Amino acid sequence: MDRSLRPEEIEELREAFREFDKDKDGYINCRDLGNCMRTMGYMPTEMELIELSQQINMNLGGHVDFDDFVELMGPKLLAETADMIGVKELRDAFREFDTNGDGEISTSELREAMRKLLGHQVGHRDIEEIIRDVDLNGDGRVDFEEFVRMMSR
Ligand SMILES: [Ca+2]
Ligand SMILES: [Ca+2]
Report the alpha-carbon distance of residue 69 to residue 150 in Å, rounded: 27
CA of 6 to the centre of ligand 1 (A): 21
CA of 144 to the centre of ligand 2 (A): 9
**CA gap 41, 57 in Å, rounded:** 23
* 33 vs 49: CA distance, rounded Å: 7
Phi first, then psi: give them for residue 45, nearest 5 degrees.
-100, 160
CA atoms within 13 A on the CB side of 125: 0
What is the CA(142)–ligand 1 centre distance, in A? 9
- Was 77 annotated as part of a binding site? no
Flag whether 104 is marked binding. Answer: yes
Spell out the domains of the chain, with CATH numbers in brackets.
Answer: 1-80 (1.10.238.10), 81-153 (1.10.238.10)
Resolution expressed in Å? 2.9
Give CA separation, 5 vs 11, 85, 106, 124, in Å.
10, 16, 24, 24
Structural contact between residues 11 and 34, judged by C-beta atoms closer than 8 angstroms: no
Query: Which helix (DSSP H) or strand (DSSP E) does residue 34 occupy?
Result: helix 30-38
Residue 115 Cα to ligand 1 midpoint, Å, equals: 16
